[PDB]
Amino acid sequence: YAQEKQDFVQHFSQIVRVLTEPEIGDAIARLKEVLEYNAIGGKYNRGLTVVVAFRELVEPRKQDADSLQRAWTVGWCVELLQAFFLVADDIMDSSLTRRGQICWYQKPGVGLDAINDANLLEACIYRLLKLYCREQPYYLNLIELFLQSSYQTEIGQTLDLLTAPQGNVDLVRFTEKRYKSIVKYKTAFYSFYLPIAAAMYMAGIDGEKEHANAKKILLEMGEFFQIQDDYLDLFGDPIGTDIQDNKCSWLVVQCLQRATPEQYQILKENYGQKEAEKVARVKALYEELDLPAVFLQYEEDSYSHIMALIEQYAAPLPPAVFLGLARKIY
Amino acid sequence: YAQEKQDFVQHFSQIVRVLTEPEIGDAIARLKEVLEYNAIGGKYNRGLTVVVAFRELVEPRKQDADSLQRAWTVGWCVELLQAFFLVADDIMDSSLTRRGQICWYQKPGVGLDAINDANLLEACIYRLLKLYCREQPYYLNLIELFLQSSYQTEIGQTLDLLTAPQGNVDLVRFTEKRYKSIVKYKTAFYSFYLPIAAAMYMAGIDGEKEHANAKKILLEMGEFFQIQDDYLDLFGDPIGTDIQDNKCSWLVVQCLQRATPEQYQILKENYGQKEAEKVARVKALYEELDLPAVFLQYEEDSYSHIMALIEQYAAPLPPAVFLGLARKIY
Ligand SMILES: CC(C)=CCC/C(C)=C/CC/C(C)=C/COP(=O)(O)OP(=O)(O)O
Ligand SMILES: CC(C)=CCC/C(C)=C/CC/C(C)=C/COP(=O)(O)OP(=O)(O)O
Predict the structure, then answer these.
(1) Is A311 exposed, middle or buried (0-12, 13-18, 19+ CB in 10 A)?
(2) Which domains does chain A have, with CATH numbers?
(3) Considering only CA atoms, which residue is closest to atom 16 of ligand 2?
(4) Partner-chain contact B158 A123, CB within 8 Å
(5) H-state helical runs in chain A
């Protein structure tokens, strides 16, 4: 999809144009700057998912120019939701950089003003829905989908913040039931359920049971995507900081299920600190418990399980919708 | 309305209950805390407006228990929107206190986490709309009304932030066309248009022309409410800090229209600073230009104008809807 990703991206100037059309001129200027700095520069996978899935779902003799345009406007709505989250998350986490660039809030002259910038980005989603989809039968379903996605993601954030407060290592918090809960709400619902559900709605597939079937496949994919993401944070080939941030990682979760009382202390003494040698130490405790090996077995079991879910729950959607995602994430 | 305000407030425990009903339990706990600390302790005028206006608008033989409950749930949605804004605004402004209590973000252990708390408060609006109004014909109109209110308010904030950046006195920015624009977007739309429009929708009054008529009265009221609020910041009987915050106040606007080149300097040298004697100095420049006298004339002219607007635009709504607001604000 390098092709499909250049076409989706090229549609961005038109989204910006339509959103940034007297004395509020200067505010609309600042909105343009917020959009440009923060909705561009990622890999665009969530929004492209909308477009690809829409094409695979719709009767080919219903894809006219205006349909296709709605599909990429909705893909862009997914990207705007992402941008809202990241901008706000980066403030909350005190991050320095995003997508290799200075975080928006770290720019001179922006600072905490970025909280309202982030709100504007969210508000843009509903402005585009109304401009392009208000007369469509699925309008209200998409508004409700984006609202619900936002809520789930926010709840997930809350849970994450309570579980892993920076500067307070408390490993009793990092249970597997907690980890899974974080991932489902903070990440899997918006990343995986949102984009395909949207495409579904747009294709006229509005039934509760179908949505639920697809959700079942898609939240399981999101679980694997994040677990993988956690693994690679520490063992991928590029550097990552989950351990120097007291994160509720799949790794520390696994480590904690397999530690003796002695190891549990090595972790209690070394998790969630800045010094390289003590982060060095946890990575070495991880390799001692054969965590990469546990990951590899997990990834195999996970992949068979997803194929089973696709076999039981894809119908009557084309399996290819779910297979394409599996192929990208695995 | 001390009576009506005790009944509206008593409905709060039920709103909290319905919103805070396994492993996300701890997040839902934190949501409860956010709701309790931040949606209570104000004067509740925006949400009560919903309820009062709904009663004055609806056929009396349509106010059954479930109607009334929707009306106060929507009044509470207005209060939640307010709470979202204030929480986020207080972070942005670096404020210490709100409604005489420590600002939420200033509590130990909260800090910037409050950005996600504020998002949750906003998200609560749409959860209550869906729980109580999803089967009503006005459901989508209310979702769109709250979304649009949010956008207008955010745009207003952006404009305010650009116009009055803390630590940068630039009086060339404080024009009357700019002041009016700030007030319309940041304050008047959500405070005055939102609550009556909502009540209108709920009463079955969905027509564009009627909404526009009412908007005309209501945005003019909001202009007077804020102008008054600016005046009283400095001359009310309690202390206020617009001048020590470089605010785009109605006062500095008026002062600037009436200053000679010499006075303009007194202002350029003394506006937007912390030292009591230099704030002392601006207040004295204001009293030299007879700004309280300009305010008094403004308040009289404004009041006649609002009565004229009510006479030309209230119909077919009961004038009493608009008169009640006028009586509270004047
Ligand atoms: C339906 C179909 C056949 C689609 C085509 C395949 C496709 C575009 C899959 C994308 C899947 C996705 C949302 C991955 C998130 O990864 P990311 O690495 O972008 O995550 P990050 O943003 O968190 O880095
Ligand atoms: C329709 C009708 C007949 C209603 C009854 C009258 C009524 C409740 C009017 C309230 C008007 C209002 C929203 C004032 C905001 O002032 P505030 O001082 O609460 O503003 P602040 O929150 O910014 O201090």
Answers:
(1) exposed
(2) 1-330 (1.10.600.10)
(3) B45
(4) no
(5) 2-10, 12-19, 25-39, 45-57, 65-93, 114-133, 139-163, 176-183, 194-202, 208-235, 250-258, 261-270, 276-288, 291-313, 319-329
